[PDB]
C-alpha cells in the first residue's frame, strides 16, 4: 500500500465530492489481483504531494470498453504571493 | 533577437570546447605552468 492514508476514501474506494484533500493522499482506491490467499495489490491514486485543496467534482462512468472510468476534479484558490509573476 | 539566439548557443559551444582545451593546466611549487603530463607551458605564470 501507499504511505498515504485511505480513510478519506469511500466505502467503494472513492472520495465524496467537496472533501478536503492534502498531497500524497489516496484519492482513488483501486486494487488488482495477484497471479497465483492475500492475492491482491494496491492500485490506488495518491494525490500529488505538492497539491492540496478540496474535491470539486467526482465522476463515475464507464470507458469505451465498458469498464468503470472515473474523472476526478480537485480545486483550490491561487492567491498571489511574494515572488509571483505579473506583467503589463 | 535572431542574432542573439544564434550567438548565445555558438558562444556556449566555443566556451565548452575551450574549457575542454585547457582543463588540466596548473601553476606549481616551482612557479612553472605545466599540464597533467607535466609539459611546461609558460616558464613563468604571466612571466610574473
Amino acid at each position: 500500500l501507499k504511505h498515504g492514508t485511505y480513510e478519506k476514501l469511500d466505502e467503494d474506494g472513492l472520495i465524496a465530492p467537496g472533501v478536503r484533500v492534502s498531497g500524497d493522499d489516496i484519492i482513488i482506491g483501486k486494487t488488482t489481483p495477484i497471479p497465483p490467499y492475500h492475492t491482491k495489490r494496491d492500485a490506488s491514486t495518491p494525490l500529488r504531494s505538492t497539491e492540496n485543496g478540496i474535491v470539486d467534482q467526482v465522476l463515475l462512468t464507464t470507458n469505451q470498453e465498458g469498464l468503470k472510468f472515473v474523472k476526478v476534479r480537485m480545486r483550490t484558490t491561487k492567491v498571489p504571493q511574494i515572488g509571483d509573476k505579473f506583467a503589463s | 533577437l535572431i542574432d542573439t539566439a544564434v550567438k548565445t548557443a555558438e558562444t556556449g559551444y566555443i566556451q565548452r570546447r575551450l574549457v575542454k582545451a585547457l582543463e588540466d593546466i596548473m601553476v606549481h611549487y616551482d612557479g612553472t605552468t605545466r599540464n597533467s603530463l607535466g609539459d611546461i607551458i609558460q616558464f613563468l605564470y604571466g612571466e610574473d
Partner: protein
C-alpha cells in the same frame, strides 16, 4: 550538476567538496578488485569472509 559548474568551482578549486558531493550526494559505490589482474573480478562474501 553542470559541466560549467564543475569548471567554475574548479577555477575555485574546491576539491574536497567536489569529490564528496559527486560521491555522497550521488551514487557512491564500493567494490572489490583483484590487483593481480587489476580488475573487479573478486568473488566475495562477508560473514564467511
Amino acid at each position: 550538476f553542470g559541466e560549467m559548474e564543475r569548471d567554475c568551482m574548479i577555477a575555485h578549486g574546491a576539491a574536497g567538496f567536489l569529490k564528496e558531493r559527486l560521491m555522497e550526494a550521488s551514487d557512491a559505490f564500493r567494490v572489490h578488485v583483484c590487483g593481480i589482474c587489476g580488475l573487479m573480478s573478486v568473488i566475495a562474501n562477508l560473514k564467511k569472509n
